[PDB]
Amino acid sequence: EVNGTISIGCSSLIGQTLLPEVLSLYNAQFPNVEIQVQVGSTEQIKANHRDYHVMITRGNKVMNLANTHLFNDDHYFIFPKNRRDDVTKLPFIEFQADPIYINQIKQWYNDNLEQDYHATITVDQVATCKEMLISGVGVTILPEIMMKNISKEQFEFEKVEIDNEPLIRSTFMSYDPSMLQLPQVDSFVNLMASFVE
Amino acid sequence: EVNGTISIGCSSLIGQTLLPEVLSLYNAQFPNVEIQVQVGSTEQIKANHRDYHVMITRGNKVMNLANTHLFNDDHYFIFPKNRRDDVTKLPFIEFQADPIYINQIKQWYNDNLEQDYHATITVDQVATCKEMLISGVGVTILPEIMMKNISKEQFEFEKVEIDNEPLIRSTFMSYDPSMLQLPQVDSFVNLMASFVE
Ligand code: NA
Ligand code: NA
Ligand code: NA
Ligand code: NA
Structure with a gap:
């Protein structure tokens, strides 16, 4: 026992x-x-x-x-549906992690939103980042394991692909x-x- | 500006x-x-x-x-409804905080469940504690600000009173x-x- x-x-x-x-x-x-x-x-x-x-x-x-x-984990870029036309102007929420991983996120943003990466809000925890997103603070990329109970009515989820291969963690x-x-x-x-x- | x-x-x-x-x-x-x-x-x-x-x-x-x-914040002791008759035998989830606050929780448990306080699971973060509760790990006390999206169907919420005055944080x-x-x-x-x- x-x-x-x-x-x-x-x-x-x-x-x-x-x-x-x-x-x-x-x-x-x-x-x-x-x-x-x-x-x-x-x-x-x-x-x-x-x-x-x-x-x-x-x-x-x-x-x-x-x-x-x-x-x-796959990843998704997440933004509010009511602001789709303004996604390039919305603040990006960055979380802290190792450089290889974060630089993949930054590169994806630079390539896909067609502008320099800039994080208006920086937090240490992914969980904090998730709640910032939910409360309407801005846009972000989350790992799939952290996407439970995010409103599908309120938010668009765009799978994060790099050269048609998923960004993974x-x-x-x-x-x-x-x-x-x-x-x-x-x-x-x-x-x-x-x-x- | x-x-x-x-x-x-x-x-x-x-x-x-x-x-x-x-x-x-x-x-x-x-x-x-x-x-x-x-x-x-x-x-x-x-x-x-x-x-x-x-x-x-x-x-x-x-x-x-x-x-x-x-x-x-007021506080609530939270336990699964299907195990009401066994609440005294269920593991208690403790979070880390200053001694005055935690000792109030311990005293409440000792007085109200009529047995020595013992924490089977100890976590640092209240947020971690909340997810342990939700996943069915055991029973706990949470502050009211952390009780959003806990199932009212699954869980009983008992207001934590000490001498008919609420435990507060x-x-x-x-x-x-x-x-x-x-x-x-x-x-x-x-x-x-x-x-x-
Ligand atoms: Na982090
Ligand atoms: Na991010
Ligand atoms: Na804590
Ligand atoms: Na507790």
Whole structure:
């Protein structure tokens, strides 16, 4: 019977989406495990890797750990339908992430709106960015996992393609193989790997 | 005509709720202002006060700055309706905050569920806590500002009273008075103060 504590570190948006779904199943199966969750940037979580049994991050694989690819996100440029004719003049909401990923977003904007990229609003979290969009602050690109409960009546969703290939963002589960001896950690890793497949 | 950059630091949950609503009005009135937003714990935002023109935090007033009281939140204990008879056995989801506030939550639980407080799941962000609740992970107390789009069909909401007085959490806007000379900062402060009234 599985006991003890599990300490999970994850990308901020993962704490709002995938991790809650998985922990609902995990706790139901393994009720005696104490669960600790810290969220932050992928950079922050990677830096504090020693504090976590398991990490769920986005972008590239984590150095010197076992990595399991969970899924990829497509992306959508999102803007209000009532302002379609004025999309080039609406403020763009940028979130913080690694340069390779953000530069893809900037390049897409430059190429497709036919003008220099400029972010009027900059936020750290994708979740913050999502709420700025919803409240009418401006336009943005979001990963598909963050598009739940955005009004299809109010907003147009344009799939973000670069040379007819989708812009994608990967999500990885990472951990030190020596944590798998802990049944709470093994049970989580096995459940996560099963959930996505 | 108002120009320049404004740097806002706020409580994580404020970035998901109040700040998006206010920035939608702010940008519409003052389109040439560049907006920078960082979210975090009240403790983190207070520590990095020098990085922000204006701060929106929760709990007590910020030391050695001008403070404007924005609003108070009531609180609700939230649990799934299908498990009403088993509420005492369901895992409690705790979020991180200052001890005075968290101890009020713990005391309420101890008094009203008639057993020792124990958090099976601990998260840093209230927003994370909300999604854990929604996904069926367990039970929790949330501030009223964070209760939008939680299913009334699925969940019971019990107002959190302590001696027939509501458990409350205050929100404050803080800034160094010498930032008000900047028209972008003055315009924001005046708008926020007006919005809540
Ligand atoms: Na980010
Ligand atoms: Na974006
Ligand atoms: Na918190
Ligand atoms: Na709580």
